[model samples]
Target: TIPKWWKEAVFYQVYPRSFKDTNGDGIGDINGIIEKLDYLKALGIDAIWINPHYDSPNTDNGYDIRDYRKIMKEYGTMEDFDRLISEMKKRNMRLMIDVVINHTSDQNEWFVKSKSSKDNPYRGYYFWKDAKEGQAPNNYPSFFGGSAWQKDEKTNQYYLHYFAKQQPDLNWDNPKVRQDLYAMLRFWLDKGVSGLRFDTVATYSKIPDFPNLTQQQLKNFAAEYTKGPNIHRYVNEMNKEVLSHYDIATAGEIFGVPLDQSIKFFDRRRDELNIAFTFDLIRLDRDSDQRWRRKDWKLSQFRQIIDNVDRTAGEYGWNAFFLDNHDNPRAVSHFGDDRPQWREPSAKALATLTLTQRATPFIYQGSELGMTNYPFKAIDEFDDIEVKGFWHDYVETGKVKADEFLQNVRLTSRDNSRTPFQWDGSKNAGFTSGKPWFKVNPNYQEINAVSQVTQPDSVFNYYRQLIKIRHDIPALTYGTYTDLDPANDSVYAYTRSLGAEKYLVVVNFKEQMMRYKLPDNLSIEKVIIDSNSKNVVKKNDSLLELKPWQSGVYKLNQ
Candidate 1:
């Protein structure tokens, strides 16, 4: 058995670009985050995951790496970053930094020198191949709504860019690049940083053959590479050289890896990573021509997915679980009741359903207080680079009007999660001293954190109790999981066991009242935690009345 502190630690994901702005520069920086360390500590989070703040041109919103060793001027100096780490550690919080090494900005020193001439020493540092007689090697598309290949006059070749032309793909085939990345990893590790959340971890190793895609849906990514055969070797090398040398937690943004393969990536025995994020649950929404195709998703749809992760991972290894992050829309908009009337109840219900699982639960910023999505009526209000790409792709490709597509962007925009932290109903939501990089969600005035922190019955407090519940009881972190209510289509129910003690968690997914009947063998009916009222349990009974969107955890007999 392993005793990893992060196994029981609660995490909060912070998108630094919009988390806070101390200099009134409309961008969140390390100093801005330093001011909020106490706030996160008060909310009961044990660790923080800060998005990339490295030196970059912001071509892909900081995903385009210019230099991995220095902080961008917009995000302040390295000293400020060090201050943030120190302050967070003072609060007993481990800091996790985003390691964005999949690609480098065209303006990066290495890329600039590499593309200067065909005979440049670093010319092979990036993917550069001559066009197929005045045409791209393949008809692959870029993630930023353009051809994946761009011509370079100096070399008479087309460079590959799976994401944006300005963000050229790195040639991991170069051992120098791998060594450089490992060196940077050691640099951060030496600075008291506790972990690294890898961005597009599996994308580092390319197939090299550059095979074409067979499906239109995967035209952009699959056409070239996704978890190439060489990826396992690269990850194993990284584990040996970078990971095994330190006692730290690691997680990766992985794709195309099957369930069994993904389990291997996170297996404690593998000595590779602590966990990995999966989109198997979020992909439930359909963005097909039939607009409302997946609008009718039911609790049963998520039940199988969640249950599979809970049951399979415990049986074999550990898993990473999350509902929302910087790359996705607010979880409330994706999974919660949208109607203003049923928001709080539905929020709490979903929280318990995700937290009680056997996997490591991640709570994105503002999720604890039930923050909803931003209301944007137009495209100009948006700031994410992906939203602009989709808007142009839809219109230029003759799919839909820019205005109509902008509605979907608002409804499912990454900008929805990039909004400033709604700390108080003050100017800039108490997150910044100046205008924010992305517009703060207008609803912040009513859904801010200061409003919820004082009230004992507030959703904010419920989050504290939920985290504490897991903190006090070690079983919830290392318990055996089982989905007990597979027959109930409108509810999500599960039981977790640790030897003689077992706990049952039930959630009503409907907007109307629901009924439940516990088994006769279970004797204790204590309410361990409830989302709404402080006291939501009653005496032993066969039937239980669940309020609209209510969720509760109960201690049961053997």
Candidate 2:
């Protein structure tokens, strides 16, 4: 495998609107991010992927771009963006912009003109189809909630919207649209940015004939919607035309793409994209293909999921080892117990799992502080458009009861992860002096950045130390990964070998004591790190002990 540095560095995702609010508008901005550059560097972040900050109607939290060329007004201006990039460089960090080209806001000038009249030249920029026998073209449903198709009242025809009605899908079949998006790519790369994180990259191409789907297929709509006949062709063209010319890194949020097809995007020979973010570890709680459902998982299942990703991208492509992001709930809350006594240790255990795995680790904001999901008791407590969409379909229409939906929403809603960043324990959690855009998780008083950063054994510091260990140990990155006790359910044990250097990591997933059997020839060289407890030493010099939620990394002699 030809190597790229992106395979080496850890990426931290900062959801801009929730990171830090500097202007007292209850919204985080570019300036707020600038104020925290040193904090990111201290956390050992090599790069930062800020969520969509482009001018938008805030429909999908800036995913619906109204003016991509301009920065969001709530966020700063182009001048501030230049400062963000330059300051990031000063700290030896790279910046990855969120590229949202799949669709644009319905209020965008192009869409406005396109929807004005069927005969308009701009009409080709979007997908507008006449009714098929007076019914909407297909049986597709919007990812947010209702039908994917939204009718243009003026044009008296339907336009396709895979997400919210405000987000109208662009017609990739149009040569002009492809050319225009490519030009925009040049505009950013030429401005000194180092990477692009493509939003909905899998949905770039689609079936020419929007076919109807059965109920079973619609159950897991993403698996079907993410498929396209001409997708590879389009991605390859994109690489050849715009991306190949730059030295920057590229990653696509290609949802629903299974392991077998990974090479299409991640295999460098394909010359398409550098990274493909998968969802196996993140989707562990769902029994349904639907995102909002919660399903309990065993430790064996968690171990198997990580191994599955490692094997899937095994010999060829790279893996993106991540548990949570802006879209999913906090990792610690889902993967480990979030109770007061368990939160820190569990967070540390998860940090060890994510960082030491043989993949580029993605650390989401506030996960360092072991942030838990907000207690969402009522429908009005949420702000996410996606959650509201589901509410409309499930609660408003009586498809599900309010309490049942609320119970599920607490565990599955994006808003749970989208709460304001907890900088300190002060009022507004030190996120803003004014009223916050979203309610800060009430637990912020005890769990926050300031408290964790200064305290020696806090989850924040544990993350910091683990991030450094990953950079110093080649065995962690280039080492061959193999599970030690593959069938065990309560504990996960794995070994990574690079040349003569090998390391064993054993972690307890439950809230009680556990033990691990050591190999006959195993000899400890060093104790790299430990989580939850320092009691990893062997009891009989043959069996290792682990306290509740404990994890230990030992450097071993081959």
Candidate 3:
């Protein structure tokens, strides 16, 4: 069942390495995060979701775990992490850690032993297949590009990896793996952490027969792995063993999960997960084959996805709402007008749309200050392994032009969000003292948090206000959503109804002025909030004029 605290609580994601570096070591550590608890508390978020900071070689930026029980040496020690937990508890803030169990680093003891020999007991911990005529067993492609199968020199057998070769996919077909995984979950739950965000949860189950992919199937190998048969069985088993015993929340990153199957993960009747995220809307800019094809998407397309989700999960299950994260580009840079003339209003408009929906809203780090995409001039500036792989496989080949590929990389690269957080307009954006692992976005002079914190109209203050409103208004969290102008191209208008109290949310996404009218039976009882400070009034007796990129919320009088 859903908890009251989770439904009303606002979440902020913190990428540890880029959040702060208090030890003067280029990398941000646990102490750095502890130093920023007050800043997060002041941002009005009730909970914080920290990305994977577990022991790892950082081949995939901590996604490839080397050890489940240890902390990354660069991050901090166990004592430091304990101190962080204690500090957050003192502020009444909840902590949610990422649980990445889909795969582990090749350096993991289990994988090390598994690859030692075919008859080894640990060999069953991961998938291993014999090469067919010196070729990989299947033609499935990895998420980061290249063949999903990697040949081991010692055993001359192929191993499965959905991502990088360093990240070997675990074989959940082995009951021992499940027991070990469930034990780790209990270990964390025994700790003071409030919840766990399961990474790549749907990729656990796989088809027993590793059949070759057809031409069309090769285009999207994700279809073969996501939501495979017996995924629910594994999720249910985990829930019954560790999750149900705790009063904690569970969110899963389910790839390619549709509306019909979404309820299985979040429905109150099913004790699976509390919420889950799918990349349906995020993939709008990509090609049908999941390649990054630069193209403009229509407002109707965005509305259609949201409308479908509202009709399905909004009524039956919970959806985790977010526009940006560590794996994505900045929300304002991608969805809003990030130009200087309209950045503030467009950012606030996005905030109004995301935070007001009947879902749990997540604010990615540095998003509150309206951080734009980094101006990556050269491919060398990128630290993401996936970007490097694309550059080598596609850019070097004639498939994609170097300049065109670089342009798309700047717009969509994960490094856009991984750059050190802009704290002040100092050298290295005040994120470190020695040297940053990644280059800081040079626009820090104008977008730093220190400057925006005091500016009433700045994006930081706007986000603070939005978080407060979400907490103050019951309808914002518990209302039924209705799209007022589903067919409208430029304006997105929606209403939230909770008994006698109703709220209207309207936003103009483009750079031109738009006219909207309140329903005949409803009138504006009060102006709850607006992106701009201008007062809104009825124009021509019912029609309301909105400036470019302007968004506003109102209490509708019935």
Residue pair clashes in candidate 2: 142-148
Candidate number that wins on lDDT, 1 or 2: 2
In angstroms, how far off is 186's CA in candidate 2? 0.7
lDDT (tens digit, per residue) of candidate 3 on 1-558: 234788778999999989999878899888889988999899998899999989999999999999999999989999998898899999999999999998999999999999999899999999999999889998878877688899998899999999899999999989999999999878877878998999988889888688888898777667767747889899999989889898887888987565567778877777788876767776678665636555788888888888787666754578778899998889999999889987878998998887898888889999999999988898788899888877777877778898898878788888989999999988888899979988788889989999999888888999999899988998998888888767777888888888899998989876788777766566787788987665446423356688899898888876
Candidate 1's residue-wise lDDT over 1-558, tens digit each? Answer: 465687788888887887778888888888878888887888788999888889988977889988888998899998998888888888889999898888889988889999999889888888888788689877667766668899988778999887888888888889998898799889999998998898878778877577666566463354236657777678888999998898788887775454556776676676677777776676557443322123457777788877766555655467777888887777777898756787777777777866777777888888887888888887778787776777777766878876667656666677777788888999878877777777787788878889999988777877788888988876787777777666677767778777777788888878778877766555445778766564356646445577778888888754
Q: After TM-score superposition, what is the CA distance of residue 13 in candidate 3 from its true location, in Å? A: 0.2
TM-score of each candidate? 0.95, 0.97, 0.97
lDDT of 2 by residue, 78-102 (tens): 9999999999999989999999988
Higher TM-score: candidate 1 or 3?
A: 3
Top-scoring candidate (lDDT): 2
Residue 400 of candidate 1: its Cα lDDT?
Answer: 81
Position 237, candidate 2: lDDT: 94
lDDT of 3: 0.85
Q: Model 3: residues >4 Å from true position, as ranges?
A: 1-3, 538-541
Ten-residue stretch with the least lDDT total in model 3: 533-542
Against the true structure, what is every candidate's RMSD?
2.3, 1.6, 1.6
lDDT sort, best first:
2, 3, 1
